[PDB]
Copies of this chain bind each other. A is one copy, B any other.
């Protein structure tokens, strides 16, 4: 079902996961669930224009978790 998430679904997920400031970057880059499942580490860390601290946790604890589950 993550593969079916809209951009707004992705924004809502990261808002509810505790990254409401960084969630808007997924809207800015038009990242839906299908694109989310295609992202690699450098895409999150350097491609979203977000601070490195949250970016590291967004990838390792959510994007990577989503791609593996």
Chain A residues in contact with chain B, CB under 8 A? 7, 26, 28-32, 34-35, 38-39, 42-43, 45-48, 51-54, 56-57, 60
Query: Separation in Å of the A48 CB from the closest CB of chain B?
Result: 7
Main secondary structure of the interface of A (DSSP, over half): helix
Whether A47 contacts B47 by the Cβ 8 Å rule is no
Q: Given contacts A30-B52, A32-B53, could you give 8 more A-B pairs where the C-beta distance is less than 8 Å?
A: A7-B53, A29-B51, A30-B53, A30-B54, A31-B56, A35-B54, A35-B57, A48-B52
23 pairs, A vs B, C-beta closer than 8 Å: A7-B53, A26-B53, A29-B51, A30-B54, A31-B53, A31-B56, A32-B53, A34-B57, A35-B52, A35-B54, A35-B56, A35-B57, A38-B57, A38-B60, A39-B56, A42-B42, A43-B45, A43-B52, A45-B47, A46-B46, A46-B47, A47-B52, A48-B52
